């Protein structure tokens, strides 16, 4: 759903607004 827009395809985000891989980036 498009609310905060989101990030690039395959990017999850934290409450702070950090984009990283849908899986574990490196440090999870």
């Amino acid at each position: 759903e498009n609310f905060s827009g989101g990030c690039v395809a395959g990017y999850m985000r934290t409450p702070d607004g950090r984009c990283k891989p849908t899986f574990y980036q490196l440090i999870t």
Side-chain angles (χ1 to χ4, degrees):
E1 282 53 74
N2 290 272
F3 180 73
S4 319
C7 209
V8 188
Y11 288 87
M12 288 301 184
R13 283 168 48 154
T14 60
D16 343 278
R18 296 167 60 180
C19 286
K20 57 103 176 188
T22 38
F23 48 88
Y24 70 134
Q25 188 271 95
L26 203 167
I27 49 180
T28 58

